Amino acid sequence: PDAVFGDRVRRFQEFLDTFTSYRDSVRSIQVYNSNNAANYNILPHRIIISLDDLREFDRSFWSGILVEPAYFIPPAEKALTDLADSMDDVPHHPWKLSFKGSFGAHALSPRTLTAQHLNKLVSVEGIVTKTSLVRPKLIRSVHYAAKTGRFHYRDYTDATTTLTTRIPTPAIYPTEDTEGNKLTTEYGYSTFIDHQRITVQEMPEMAPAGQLPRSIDVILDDDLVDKTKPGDRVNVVGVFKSLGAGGMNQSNSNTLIGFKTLILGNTVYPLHAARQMLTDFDIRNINKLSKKKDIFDILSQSLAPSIYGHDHIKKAILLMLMGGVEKNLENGSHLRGDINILMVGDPSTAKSQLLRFVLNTASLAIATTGRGSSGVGLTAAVTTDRETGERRLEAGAMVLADRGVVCIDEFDKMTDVDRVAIHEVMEQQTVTIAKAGIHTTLNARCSVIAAANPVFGQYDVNRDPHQNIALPDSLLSRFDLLFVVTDDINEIRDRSISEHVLRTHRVTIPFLRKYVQYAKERVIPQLTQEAINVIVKNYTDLRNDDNTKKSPITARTLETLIRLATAHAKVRLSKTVNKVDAKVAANLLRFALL
Amino acid sequence: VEQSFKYTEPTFCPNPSCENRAFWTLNVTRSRFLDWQKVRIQENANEIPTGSMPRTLDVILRGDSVERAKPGDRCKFTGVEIVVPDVTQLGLPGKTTEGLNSGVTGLRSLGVRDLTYKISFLACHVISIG
Amino acid sequence: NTEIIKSFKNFILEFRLDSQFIYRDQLRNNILVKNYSLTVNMEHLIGYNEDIYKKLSDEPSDIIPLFETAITQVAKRISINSLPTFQLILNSNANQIPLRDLDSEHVSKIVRLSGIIISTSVLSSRATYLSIMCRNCRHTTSITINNFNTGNTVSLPRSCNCGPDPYIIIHESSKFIDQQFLKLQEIPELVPVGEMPRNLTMTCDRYLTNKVIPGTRVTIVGIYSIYNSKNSGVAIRTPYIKILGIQSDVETVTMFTEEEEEEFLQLSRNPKLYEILTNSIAPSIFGNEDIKKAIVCLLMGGSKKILPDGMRLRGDINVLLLGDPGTAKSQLLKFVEKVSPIAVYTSGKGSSAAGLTASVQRDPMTREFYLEGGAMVLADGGVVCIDEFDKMRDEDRVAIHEAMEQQTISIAKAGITTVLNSRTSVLAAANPIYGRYDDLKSPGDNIDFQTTILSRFDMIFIVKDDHNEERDISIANHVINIHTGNANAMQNQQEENGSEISIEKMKRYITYCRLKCAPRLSPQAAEKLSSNFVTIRKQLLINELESTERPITIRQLEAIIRITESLAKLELSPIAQERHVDEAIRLFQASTMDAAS
Amino acid sequence: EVEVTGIYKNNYDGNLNAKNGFPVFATIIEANSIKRREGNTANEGEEGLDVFSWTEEEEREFRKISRDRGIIDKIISSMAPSIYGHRDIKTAVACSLFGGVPKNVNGKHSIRGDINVLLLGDPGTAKSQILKYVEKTAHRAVFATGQGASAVGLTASVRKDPITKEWTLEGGALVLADKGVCLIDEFDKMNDQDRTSIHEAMEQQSISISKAGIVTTLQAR
Amino acid sequence: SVRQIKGDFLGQLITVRGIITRVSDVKPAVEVIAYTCDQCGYEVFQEVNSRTFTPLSECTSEECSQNQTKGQLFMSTRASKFSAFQECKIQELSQQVPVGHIPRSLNIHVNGTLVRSLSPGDIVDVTGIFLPAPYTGFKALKAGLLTETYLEAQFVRQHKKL
Amino acid sequence: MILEGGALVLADNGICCIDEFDKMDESDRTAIHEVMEQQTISISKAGINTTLNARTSILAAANPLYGRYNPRLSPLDNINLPAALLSRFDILFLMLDIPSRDDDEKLAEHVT
DNA sequence: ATCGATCGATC
DNA sequence: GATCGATCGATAAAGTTTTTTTT
């Protein structure tokens, strides 16, 4: 390599000013790895070259990285490895790149392919839904002759070097080298690496409807494994690459494609459209916005700026979405620290409107729509052979609902399969099944949001208020709040309605989502010896006034009456259970029961 | 003559010193045929001790005896016995330790394999009382 | 051959009609904007020589590559290296033998067809320029694979002791073309005895792909060559069509010429559109003026607001008919199918309502599931049409509730759970409980139990059966005019040619006037509808004191504001007016008192 | 239903994989001709061979039988010979299989070209025989009668795939029959099932369906 | 826990807790061999590789080979010792698992005399050494450099047992 | 084709504690009689016709029907099988609820 | 990648 | 003519959730 190395050589003296600002960063991350591990009684090798600093004073060295990125990456590795030992070697893994920056119109949505930038750089976004296995793989073993006591050294290349077209080495353990020594190999002195195949869908909103969502796939490496949950808005960028032999294999390969498009990539980025950083300024404003004695009322009407009223409902959603704690019993069954509300209403009264705008501020809570299929909380042994001979229990919809919220529609308009499905997973936090394989108790902290319609028209006043839809009352007993939405005619109400549907054809949301996702990580009081005294007076009267009124209650309803006020103090962001929380919890039930 | 249980290749004693065992061509003209069928039998009802998976076997009808055996009736047979293996031929590539006796049966003069032997039955004449 | 080539570089730089010199004057005009393509128009080619056509029309594959190389060389000359190879597009119009010649003489002969494409596939890659290395001596060659007999045109050789197949396919200096495997279905009107139709297979090139959505008539020209795949008895093969040019009809992504809107702007300046379309839409329908106004506003639509928060407003309308038989509720619906850009006709039985939305299956490669079918995935922007909303008792109701009012379905089945987009618009026509006695009893019992489906629709007509002994004889005069004598073929060419609009011009017309103007109603007009509504609820509650129950709710009130947005798309005015909006309520107030009777 | 006339052949391939390999041979029937279903198999020299070939002795003859003055008073009297009865049914049922015209039009709504009679009879008059006799005298027919007529099996239905195939479309009665004969009398338990699938074969004529398959439209007049 | 054992932990010594499931039975493994020729009686010895192996010829020995007549080899059971073998699969504790993915299984083996000391449902931990094994099947069109490893046990520390 | 089972082929001479008596009753309701019916726990499938023992006590908690069990209404409105109750069982209990002023606040203190 | 069979060359 | 060696060709893969009528 003489002439193919001089521009590689010229880069080695060039970009040392580009990491004038990173030559500290490359060594400072590993001196504490030489100090955490030496004093136990941890980070990968990630070197974020900004594209700006390379673009700012180089053109020919820059232009090749977006035209022919197949001769130019093991240059930048080769300078980088010798600037690690020459920095630090005295205390007694090639430091590959990450390559973040901007790109200038390479946001190819994989519904579209390339015709010109094949084998180039490409930025790709979307959602992943495949999440296949994890499995190690060698790169190099170290043979050893026991007789004469001397080692050997051999590398085995694969489709993981990403750029060079190496002659493959399909050998597993080449034994008996040119000697008479029965060979050994110190596998602890060997080295290994892993693979993970994941397919990415299309974000199904900016793809115009003339096709179903397509998909491609990406092979990544050790640094970013177990990072992507199924259901994350991910952003990845790597090289484009074809492999395999096709079309001109030995015989009879007619009308068979032979170029598997792959991506060998880096820098998997989550996005939000957990990463929400905040300075001292905005964290102090929410302390200043924790100060007033009205913030539970201001946050209620600042949520859905299209619909009038229902402030009992509008407080309930924000009370539910932030959620309450579950103190797990030591050597005992934890109770239902989740909360599960329900709605029902005579039709076209926005009972389904507010169920889907919670999904925009979901904070990684992707819900379904409730289609009559088994798979709501199971797998039913879908394996697809897991690349020829492995069986996996691929999770349907409970790997996503953990510490999140879901919502489903048309409860009464289902078959019998979901009725036994929501039976177990409500009284029990988990599910366990051996469909065709093994029992496995995988856990899930989830909470439903319901919606249903009464069958017999406008009959919610002339008949029994209970037994009203006759879906099994085990679920009615396992839920608490059954709001009956009224739509009676008031001549000032509909007059006010008539203008608010006209002024919608043209204190804020991102501050709201930051508030709850900061208040999910602070303290939990649970304790005031007199706030617990007022609520039992506030229950035993209606425990004697349950059959003399419309609805009978149960003993588990007492666990609601702590749980609502428990999260109501989380709105206050205080380590004390106050007294004022035992007044909102009273009258909210008093509207749900009278 | 006398094509055996697998002898789909008559390759013995040509007339001149031509290329013996080089080929064959199954003439549909002079090689006369005969017609047969393969049915399963079952044990009668008044002999089973209990519902203890009543086993069975298989027969072969060779002559004019085809189609005389109306299925689903009490019936009698002739009685010649036979054993038939078929594992190695020209075409397609040929639980528990069934066929464990087969490992003894290896190493014939052609290629080393694991040839089994399963019991079967041949008939010559049928009758159907009832 | 080289001699043949000498006879095409010397022909596609001086062919002309009388002083226009066209083929240099578009090849230059196609090298500036990157397309790299020709349109030869073979019937216009014949002016040189019938022989050079006949060396083409009798023998294939060789001719296409020689022609392509000649064009590449001329393109290279019109410049002074980044120069790709080109592609050809041929087109003629002889006649289309539909699907009948199969093996007799039409093997590797030029042919022209007509069908309806239904099923696209995902893209792929084949190579066209390679660089090949040997194991033993590090030899280096380059082999181009242009045209096909699919692969295995020529294989990698053995030449450079030396072991065989010593060669490999690197990926560092290559180019790639994409194929399609889209499947063509027969246009279902021209094989009539009693039989089901059949299907073929076809692939193509990148610079003429992704030009079709499923649900259209297309004409197509190409080759009838034969491949052989070994995944059936005699050594057989299979048929397929290599295609050349989809010079089809319109798309039915808004690029077109300027004179198409010139007459449209010259027509829209005439303020007589609204009254003339009611005649000019349905030339064989006796009047029915109130219903006919509702169909033109359904096909256009309103808008879609993604207003600066999470939620949105469902900006479209969905009409619903019901009435006695013999009163045009059904034969009108085939008429809206041809005039729509995209239209689907599943009008019967509901067709296993779970299969209306989406379906999965075990797939034969890799034994996996994904999503394939649906009657709502293909009908975005356009309009569906169904009927018989009485005797679908099983699951039609549970399959349209999520499908309507948000248009955001998600399949909860064994694989994916994705919210795929939908912008559909429904339409239906049903029967009451045998028609007559329903309108001579207590005026309920139309849909036997539920009002909840009726509150999702907004606009409802109710036709009836009078006995007007005067106009009916004109109707009996009307049907004998159309049915035989066919004078309306000559009457609607002697009244249409200056006044009315033909049936195919509207298909040109509606796709342009929707996709350009984004309208909004007048802001001072909001006092009108608010003052209108408050007595309608009073007109409602004056009836419920009579022990009468059922259906009017607020969703129809936000449908009238879409109705007044509809004719604004027709006039293409960005603001609305009051002569505009009073005619809209004039259509709806003739379906407000229908709840009383 | 078909019946085939050809030769018999053998192909001793020496390879079979359902049974074991054995000294056996398969069966292949090549054909030389094929004809349609036949009816009333009692003939001796005619009506088994579909001649239907009106070449010389027929077409030269068939004009003078058309230029007479009382043919329509003669044909319908002589149509169904076995049954003397009242006249008007034989006027109608002869008119039914004679048919009209599917007159197409310009880019507008099509016109039904069919005529659909309906009989009503006392239990014991000859109404079950004229429909039986007209099945022979037509060219193609079907006789789906009474109970057991499925609500879908008349029209097209999807038969599921075999072990490596796709969900294909295999129609039943009405797509085969161009002039079909049903017996919708009073199968009341299934009257609420099938009758939503026959009264749109006339109204929205050329009806086809898309249950979990492909959206297509077959044409059956 | 098994969620983080992916990396440099090959060829090492790591204890992992878990829940034992899918207990197989005890089967005799082979460690030495002795083929008999019935002519010279020199029982040939060989080491045992992975789960598939191949016998040798008969004209290889020092007495019953090298002549015009050769002792035809065949095996004998009792002239070779046989060890113990049992296979088990592990899962996770359902509380060290993160909020996301499902738990991950693993393969374990036994040697020596630790056998018949585990049970389905044992909330236990094993301490043992690490080794990947090759696949030796369909090596070209699949399994290029993949590993599908296991761990080899050394010690079990079981807990919570008139 | 190993002989996998549920409870009564492995919980012989022990305690079989069951819940949800109205679940999967097309196979349950016969077999629960077959331990009270003496010694007929068997596998009468197509495989074999062998019969093992039956020596286990049953504790059952049949959940009632919709709403509270109306005590003014008749019993056996929520229980399924009368034949098990008449002689194949011996004694019953019940868990009725009455609103009480004194006991429930202690019960409130029992849970708070 | 390994094993078996067939063909060619040498003794 | 027979025996031995070398080269070329052939041999190993796996299943069990949606959807139809039916009782």
Ligand SMILES: Nc1ncnc2c1ncn2[C@@H]1O[C@H](COP(=O)(O)OP(=O)(O)OP(=O)(O)O)[C@@H](O)[C@H]1O
């Ligand atoms: N009570 C209300 N107040 C204000 N707006 C309303 C109300 N009810 C309905 N709307 C309007 O109706 C539109 C959509 O209503 P939506 O479709 O959610 O009814 P729905 O809850 O789906 O009824 P159902 O679930 O019974 O079908 C919204 O744009 C909203 O502005």
Ligand SMILES: Nc1ncnc2c1ncn2[C@@H]1O[C@H](COP(=O)(O)OP(=O)(O)OP(=O)(O)O)[C@@H](O)[C@H]1O
């Ligand atoms: N208003 C009308 N103007 C002109 N022709 C009409 C009208 N109404 C019906 N027809 C004619 O009726 C003929 C046949 O219609 P068809 O038999 O499909 O009616 P139908 O479907 O029974 O009516 P409906 O749709 O009410 O059930 C058509 O050729 C059509 O021309």
Ligand SMILES: Nc1ncnc2c1ncn2[C@@H]1O[C@H](COP(=O)(O)OP(=O)(O)OP(=O)(O)O)[C@@H](O)[C@H]1O
């Ligand atoms: N007018 C008639 N001329 C000759 N034969 C007749 C006449 N009426 C009845 N028959 C004879 O009576 C027999 C009984 O059959 P018939 O036609 O009465 O059944 P049907 O009552 O029409 O049955 P269905 O009511 O189910 O249609 C027939 O075989 C027919 O030959």
